Every structure is written in structure tokens, then in C-alpha cells.
């Protein structure tokens, strides 16, 4: 289907767009998952919200100052928690002189300016906010209610895993960054950019993910020694010059306001915001996910980490393999 593993962009009509679950199966039937990442531009009619007129009042409980250290294309990003602030106050910060998007002539220029300036001013990211900007009104592709088999997890123990099982908001500013990672438990994710400046993405095909991991162990041997899933700490940045230097296949794509991105199981991704914006995201699953969840690595060195028991998925949805699966086989 997609033997070169290009990132595909889809432009569904309303009728095609209607049923989220069915649309995921469709894009996979066209090979979208091979890239690890896909863009879906929803039909022009569809709006998740009538107006964003009052957002300035929204509280960001725990903005993070993103402090990037390193050199020659290899960095570590520490996120220091700051005091709560409103989106209004955040927006004004984003557009102040210290923080504002650099003058640039096009994307290649901006991207150069991102990688060149990463360690200087630490941007503030209004990340990981529990909430949704969708109107209650909205039936299709509603990040707060996608209805996939991921919903089984909460059914089973009453555990909500914020951001995984519930929607997160991210108010971004220039240079705010998501490090290289795959999702918790190698889940899919869906990401909608509500408004504002773009969010750029780098993605490595799932079939080359292990190559990335071997690369990263070669870059940070102390870290790999400390934890057998250290990329899951989500602090490793690696430039596209470096990926090219070590022959890691990747592509890049820029998501603009009003567009969805979907990441697929074991699709490594990373990227950065161009300027003030607002995105919404959560995780989801399909049957095809289960085998990834079964073998997903887990961080062995922190206690704060997302773990989902796969027992219910195999028992109910892979019943013929459940008995063997219980005994290591």
C-alpha cells in the first residue's frame, strides 16, 4: 500500500468523515500507518466549537518552563513547573519580545531557527491541561468521546488516566517542544489544532522504530543503563541533521489550525509549536493495537508511569490466544 512510508494527508467528505472508527480503518487500508503519522483535514462544514471568544479566562494550572541542554543536535529537555496563569496572561507572554516567533522567510528558515536557538531562552508550555474545547453539540471526531476499545480500561477498574483516557489541552508558544516518544503503551493518539500558529511534527516509521531506539542508546549510554525505556521519560531531542547523519528514515509535516493528526502504534514522533496556539489530544485504540500493547516497553525507574493491564483486551478480544498468552507463549 504505502511502501515508501510517506506521511499521507486525507481530505474526507462529510459522509466519509462521519464515523471516526471506520475512518481509521480506511486510512490504514491505504497504508497511512506505515509512516507512524497521518494528517486528516476535516470537511469545511465541520466545527468542534462555535467560538473561541472566552478562552483568555481558562486557567493553566501548571505551565512548564522547558529547559533544553546539549549541543550538536542532541539535547535533553527538562520541564520545570511554574505558577498557574491564565491563557490571557500566557498569550501575552507568548507574544512578548523574549518569547515571540522569530522573523523568518519560510518553514526551512523557521526550522533552522528552532534548532539553532533551542538552548537559549526556555519557552513556557501550557501543556497537559485536563479539558476539552469541544461544544457538547458535536457528535463526530469528538476527542472527549471517540468510543474505541480503549474505553474498556476504565470500565474494568474505574481508573481514569488523565490525557490517555481523557482529553488534554496544550496552549503553545514559539519553540515549545514535544520530545521523541511513542505513546504510553504504544497507543494511537489523535491531535486537533483548535487555533493559532502551526505545530510541526517529525515522525519515524514504526518499522524503523527499533533503529531509533538503538541510536538513542548509542547517544546516551548512561540513560539506557538507568532505564530500559528511557525515551519514555520524554526528554530526548534529536535534530533532523542527526537523524540523517545516522540514516534514520523520517518525514516531517506541519499541522495548521483546524487539522487533525493521528499517530499510530509505535510511531515515534517529536516536534514544536511555531507560536501561540491551542491543541487538543487524547489516546485511542483499535484491535490492531492490542499486539503492540502486549509487548510495549515500560519505564522501570519511575513510579509515576502509565501502565495498562492487557489482560482484559486479550481475554475478550483475543480469546483464542488468551490461555497461551497467560503462560509466556
Amino acid at each position: 500500500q504505502n511502501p515508501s512510508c510517506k506521511i499521507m494527508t486525507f481530505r474526507p467528505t462529510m459522509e466519509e468523515f462521519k464515523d471516526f472508527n471506520k475512518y481509521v480503518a480506511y486510512i490504514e487500508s491505504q497504508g497511512a500507518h506505515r509512516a507512524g503519522l497521518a494528517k486528516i483535514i476535516p470537511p469545511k462544514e465541520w466545527k468542534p466549537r462555535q467560538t473561541y471568544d472566552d478562552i483568555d479566562d481558562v486557567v493553566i494550572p501548571a505551565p512548564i518552563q522547558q529547559v533544553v541542554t546539549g549541543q550538536s543536535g542532541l539535547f535533553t529537555q527538562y520541564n520545570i513547573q511554574k505558577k498557574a496563569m491564565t491563557v490571557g496572561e500566557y498569550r501575552r507572554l507568548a507574544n512578548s519580545e523574549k518569547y515571540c516567533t522569530p522573523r523568518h522567510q519560510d518553514f526551512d528558515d523557521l526550522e533552522r531557527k528552532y534548532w539553532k536557538n533551542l538552548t537559549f531562552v526556555s519557552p513556557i508550555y501550557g501543556a497537559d491541561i485536563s479539558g476539552s474545547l469541544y461544544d457538547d453539540d458535536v457528535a463526530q471526531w469528538n476527542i472527549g468521546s471517540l468510543r474505541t476499545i480503549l474505553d474498556m480500561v476504565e470500565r474494568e477498574c474505574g481508573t481514569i488516566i488523565e490525557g490517555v483516557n481523557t482529553p488534554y489541552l496544550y496552549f503553545g508558544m514559539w519553540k515549545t517542544t514535544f520530545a521523541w516518544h511513542t505513546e504510553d503503551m504504544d497507543l494511537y493518539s489523535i491531535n486537533y489544532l483548535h487555533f493559532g500558529e502551526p505545530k510541526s511534527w517529525y515522525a519515524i516509521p514504526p518499522e524503523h522504530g527499533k533503529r531509533l531506539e538503538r541510536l538513542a542508546i548509542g547517544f546516551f549510554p548512561g540513560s539506557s543503563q538507568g532505564c530500559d525505556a528511557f525515551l519514555r521519560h520524554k526528554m530526548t531531542l534529536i535534530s533532523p541533521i542527526i537523524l540523517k547523519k545516522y540514516g534514520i528514515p523520517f518525514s516531517r509535516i506541519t499541522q495548521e489550525a483546524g487539522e487533525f493528526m493521528i499517530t499510530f502504534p509505535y510511531g515515534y514522533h517529536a516536534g514544536f509549536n511555531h507560536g501561540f496556539n491551542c491543541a487538543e489530544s487524547t489516546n485511542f485504540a483499535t484491535l490492531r493495537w492490542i499486539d503492540y500493547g502486549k509487548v510495549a516497553t515500560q519505564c522501570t525507574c519511575r513510579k509515576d508511569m502509565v501502565k495498562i493491564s492487557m489482560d482484559v483486551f486479550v481475554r475478550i478480544l483475543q480469546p483464542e490466544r488468551y490461555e497461551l498468552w497467560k503462560q509466556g507463549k
Binding site: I161, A179, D184
Partner: peptide, 8 residues
């Protein structure tokens, strides 16, 4: 446990 932007 919750999802997070990590970095500590």
C-alpha cells in the same frame, strides 16, 4: 499516573 510532557 497520568500522561505528561515528561522532562521530570
Amino acid at each position: 499516573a497520568r500522561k505528561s510532557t515528561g522532562g521530570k
